[PDB]
């Protein structure tokens, strides 16, 4: 259940292993 996740290329927020932090913006994204 990663994708739909919030996250940013900050690496704070990134994604569960497997899924990566697709940049729905600037900075901001969400998980794929």
Same mark, same amino acid.
Do not use: T
């Given at each position: 259940?990663? @994708?739909?996740?919030?996250?940013? !290329? ?6 569960? @292993? ?7 913006? !600037?900075? @901001?994204?969400?998980?794929?």
């Amino acid at each position: 259940g990663c @994708a739909g996740k919030s996250c940013n !290329i900050l690496g704070s927020d990134p994604c569960d @292993a497997g899924c990566f932090c697709l940049p729905v913006g !600037i900075v @901001a994204g969400v998980c794929v």
